[PDB]
Design a protein around this ligand. Sequence first.
Ligand SMILES: [Mg+2]
Ligand SMILES: [Mg+2]
Ligand SMILES: [Mg+2]
Ligand SMILES: [Mg+2]
Ligand SMILES: [Mg+2]
Ligand SMILES: [Mg+2]
Ligand SMILES: [Mg+2]
Ligand SMILES: [Mg+2]
Ligand SMILES: [Mg+2]
Ligand SMILES: [Mg+2]
Ligand SMILES: [Mg+2]
Ligand SMILES: [Mg+2]
Ligand SMILES: [Mg+2]
Ligand SMILES: [Mg+2]
Ligand SMILES: [Mg+2]
Ligand SMILES: [Mg+2]
Ligand SMILES: [Mg+2]
Ligand SMILES: [Mg+2]
Ligand SMILES: [Mg+2]
Ligand SMILES: [Mg+2]
Ligand SMILES: [Mg+2]
Ligand SMILES: [Mg+2]
Ligand SMILES: [Mg+2]
Ligand SMILES: [Mg+2]
Ligand SMILES: [Mg+2]
Ligand SMILES: [Mg+2]
Ligand SMILES: [Mg+2]
Ligand SMILES: [Mg+2]
Ligand SMILES: [Mg+2]
Ligand SMILES: [Mg+2]
Ligand SMILES: [Mg+2]
Lengths: 129, 81, 150, 144
Amino acid sequence: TRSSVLADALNAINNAEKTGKRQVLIRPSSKVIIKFLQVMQKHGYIGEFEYIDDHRSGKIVVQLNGRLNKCGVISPRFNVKIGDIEKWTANLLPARQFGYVILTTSAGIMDHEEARRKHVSGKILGFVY
Amino acid sequence: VLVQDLLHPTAASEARKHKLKTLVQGPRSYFLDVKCPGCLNITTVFSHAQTAVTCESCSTILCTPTGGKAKLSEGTSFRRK
Amino acid sequence: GRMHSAGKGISSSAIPYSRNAPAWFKLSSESVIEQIVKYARKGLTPSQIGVLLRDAHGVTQARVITGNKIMRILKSNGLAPEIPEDLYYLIKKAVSVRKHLERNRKDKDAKFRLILIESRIHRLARYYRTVAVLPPNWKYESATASALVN
Amino acid sequence: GKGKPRGLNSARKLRVHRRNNRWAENNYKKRLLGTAFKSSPFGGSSHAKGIVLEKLGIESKQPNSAIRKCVRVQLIKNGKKVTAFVPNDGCLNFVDENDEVLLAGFGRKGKAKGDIPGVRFKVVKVSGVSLLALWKEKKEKPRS
RNA sequence: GGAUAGUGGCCUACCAUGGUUUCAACGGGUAACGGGGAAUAAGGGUUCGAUUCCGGAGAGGGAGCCUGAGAAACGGCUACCA
RNA sequence: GCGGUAAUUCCAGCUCCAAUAGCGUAUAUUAAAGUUGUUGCAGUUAAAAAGCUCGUAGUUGAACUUUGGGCCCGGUUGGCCGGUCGGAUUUCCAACGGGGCCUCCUUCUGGCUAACCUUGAGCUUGGCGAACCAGGACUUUUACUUUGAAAAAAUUAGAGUGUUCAAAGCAGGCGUAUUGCUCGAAUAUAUUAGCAUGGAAUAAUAGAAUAGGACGUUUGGUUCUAUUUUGUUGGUUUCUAGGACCAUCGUAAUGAUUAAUAGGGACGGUCGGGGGCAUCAGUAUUCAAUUGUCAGAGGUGAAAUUCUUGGAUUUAUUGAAGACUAACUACUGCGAAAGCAUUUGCCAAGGACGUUUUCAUUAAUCAAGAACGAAAGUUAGGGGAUCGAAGAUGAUCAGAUACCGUCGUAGUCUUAACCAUAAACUAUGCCGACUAGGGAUCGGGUGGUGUUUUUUUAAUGACCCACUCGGCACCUUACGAGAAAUCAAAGUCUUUGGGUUCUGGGGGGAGUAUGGUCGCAAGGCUGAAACUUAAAGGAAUUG
Ligand SMILES: [Mg+2]
Ligand SMILES: [Mg+2]
Ligand SMILES: [Mg+2]
Ligand SMILES: [Mg+2]
Ligand SMILES: [Mg+2]
Ligand SMILES: [Mg+2]
Ligand SMILES: [Mg+2]
Ligand SMILES: [Mg+2]
Ligand SMILES: [Mg+2]
Ligand SMILES: [Mg+2]
Ligand SMILES: [Mg+2]
Ligand SMILES: [Mg+2]
Ligand SMILES: [Mg+2]
Ligand SMILES: [Mg+2]
Ligand SMILES: [Mg+2]
Ligand SMILES: [Mg+2]
Ligand SMILES: [Mg+2]
Ligand SMILES: [Mg+2]
Ligand SMILES: [Mg+2]
Ligand SMILES: [Mg+2]
Ligand SMILES: [Mg+2]
Ligand SMILES: [Mg+2]
Ligand SMILES: [Mg+2]
Ligand SMILES: [Mg+2]
Ligand SMILES: [Mg+2]
Ligand SMILES: [Mg+2]
Ligand SMILES: [Mg+2]
Ligand SMILES: [Mg+2]
Ligand SMILES: [Mg+2]
Ligand SMILES: [Mg+2]
Ligand SMILES: [Mg+2]
């Protein structure tokens, strides 16, 4: 069955960016979806996105643009320590001057740099660049 | 393609889509208001009634179950509700 | 899907978006609960009760006409069956298919299909035991299955 | 899902799975079974001492036609019999008979070296006087 | 209850039938004393650690015991085995 | 690989080259090895998807519940002013997320009573307990992460510093060197477990559902404990003080998340060569009886074995046996796969569909354990018409114990019980998601004054058009993949992570040996090593 809505959502985002489109439909739009895209839109990778509220689970329609290169999920969500942030960012980022590693901490969802600015750690959700 | 308005699609396409795969799913079916011949005894019935519905006054027939919509009686009158 | 087959047919209801309904209704739920219980007094299950109200009368769902559900309506009035309606139907199919094999030794198709049915019976009894709707140490067996249906 | 489990609590599956497939390797097979201790006429060592029994006229594999001038040696520490090659031009004359020789492998790590069939050892010392020094006539073989 | 410097099936009498186990018991092998550490490694790792320090065991194999705060001691004793 | 009479490859001379007080060899081990693969392997064809399905353990598993508090800076939506004639602005009430700084918490018995309504004339006599404490009854439990203490020394990285440099070592350095002075001998790392501590996103866990549910300034009562005082110490008491329990009057918007293009189930109309049992038919084949007629007929590349004037073949008439189920029959149907086609009845089952019905996460995949599993085969019967492993012959041939011709037993058929294999192939495990166009078809459905037949005329049924859900498939192209062949899956993989099961690690020895285990047996399942050695293709290209 479906195990990660984030994997299905982000795969739909990539496959639309691979084919050149400006929009994609996201089902079923969990909380960690918006938090993941809310981080993404603050960095300008996606921009406007819309929540269609069906009474079942929700839907998301996203307006895309050619800025994004790849946005995926690392499963399972490993526990990453404040010293292990470096290893993740070197393995799964194209360079160390751009790109963000999205990882959930006790203080909400944030990138690998906002974690360093706040000096907090937690579990890893994914990556966008 | 590659630029489409998924927010507000045309209703003609929404009429074509299956009742599950549309923007927000909903029942294509409806409820009837069928006038029984003779006594008024106005009653309401499902479109896919799936049972041989009949009124209490003259319990002969109003409709017959079928694999699709319910076929109404030969002589009767109905008003869409 | 179709755990015990290869079918993938998505054929189901589509509940209306409007959680309040139907906007053309007759007298309110004070009479609906009275009609639901009287259909329950003659032995009809909530599936049958719901279908009858849905088509003969106009009831999109008893869940929007009344804040409660039909089974909970029946449960509150003390008419809940000893086993849930769904489990009673797996059991009776097992009893019917078991008797068929007692006449047909060589029907290996019935052998395959009886195995699948009892596994669904087991996965529901296990689930119903955790919920505590069914007592624990409750087991399905062929010896008492026939007496359990009726 | 690429095969292997990805669950955060499946380290037990991954470690046990790795144990079962590690046996398909050859070095891990010999090391843990201790075959070199139980087989491979040495005791897992690189050199062994034995007595020359006779000389051999082993002929060359394809494509090659030559005689290799090896010797049958019976080892001291375990009594096993091996065949060992006498490498140099005309060094079969220094290993005549009954001498107590030291042997070494060929560098193939347990298999035959060249077109010499079934020979996986070579002579490195005869009478403890460093055979190589004899070919270059630097030392003299002991009289007895 | 005995015994020990003491807790404790450590031993004894009676009583109950328990305790461990696919989350790998129990059994078998180890060319296994264990660690601090060593070699090689982008990162993850692999292999080794008899051996200068820490802990344990042994004085040819077992067993037993005197003295003494402290030994089941072995450059202490007694017996059997070799 | 060189060497079989011109060896740049042996043995030497000459010359040259690498490291150089060191260089080589043997074995082991490390990197190379993305050839162990958690990061990060491979499984259509090269090695490898168990024949298929079920399902305890294990792993994984839809969505849903308020955001310490302040102080500034700057953005996006709004908001009068439109003061420009339907375009934009600032001193603005708000929300949302960004950047920098400082960054209540469950109560009571008591104190400092504190921050003090405290104010005495412009420094005075009197506020509410954690801001500091002693005790009180309650306390939903976790995983995770931050920070802190502990993780001996040597060793590791590393600060300083004269062994003359360096490996080292922890020394040393500075003066009038007459009396002496002084810096050092750091620091870091140290997984996991335990302790203390902050956060509380993510992933679990529990509560209020025939309410024995909570607050309770209240009202009867039951029970227990207990200090200072009554004049002393004990034995009895009252209220008071403190638990606990029990019932109604008294308060609450009293208390159940969606209903997953998840799953189970229900219902209605269908559908299909799905299964089991009974029943029926067809022509054919063989045989047989009766009849006419004649001498050949059979077979083959050619023949021959063979049957024939006692009538072979052929014709005609009738009958029996056992098996099969043609043509219809196709890039069509059903089934987990193996498989399944004459007819009708009975029995049970099933996918898809439709559904404004029901339950509510029951789910995905699975060690151990199992159901079924073609053909051949085994045991015991029945049957034994066809064909027919062995065999007898006739050929063929140099041989022929083969291919071909004529016969021919076990079997083919069935009942009962075993066997567990197949190139059991899509050589493609299963579940879920998204990514390009096109037509055809099967089942169900939807709509359409569409066509036809009935009662010109209705309903139906059968066709037509458009669409849809599910299915067996096919066509085009590659933005994508691949090693190519090719592939809408074998794509979404160095931009490497959806879940999960199984299998593989050069070719052989070898599916052998051995030990278990199942079987009546044949054999199945499980399953090595010693030893051997650079040598066959998945794929394409040219000949
Ligand atoms: Mg589906
Ligand atoms: Mg996990
Ligand atoms: Mg005791
Ligand atoms: Mg005791
Ligand atoms: Mg040892
Ligand atoms: Mg020591
Ligand atoms: Mg000792
Ligand atoms: Mg000794
Ligand atoms: Mg001793
Ligand atoms: Mg001594
Ligand atoms: Mg092959
Ligand atoms: Mg293969
Ligand atoms: Mg297969
Ligand atoms: Mg689970
Ligand atoms: Mg913890
Ligand atoms: Mg649903
Ligand atoms: Mg039906
Ligand atoms: Mg059938
Ligand atoms: Mg005749
Ligand atoms: Mg057909
Ligand atoms: Mg037919
Ligand atoms: Mg499954
Ligand atoms: Mg096989
Ligand atoms: Mg296969
Ligand atoms: Mg798929
Ligand atoms: Mg179709
Ligand atoms: Mg089909
Ligand atoms: Mg290998
Ligand atoms: Mg191999
Ligand atoms: Mg070669
Ligand atoms: Mg080829």
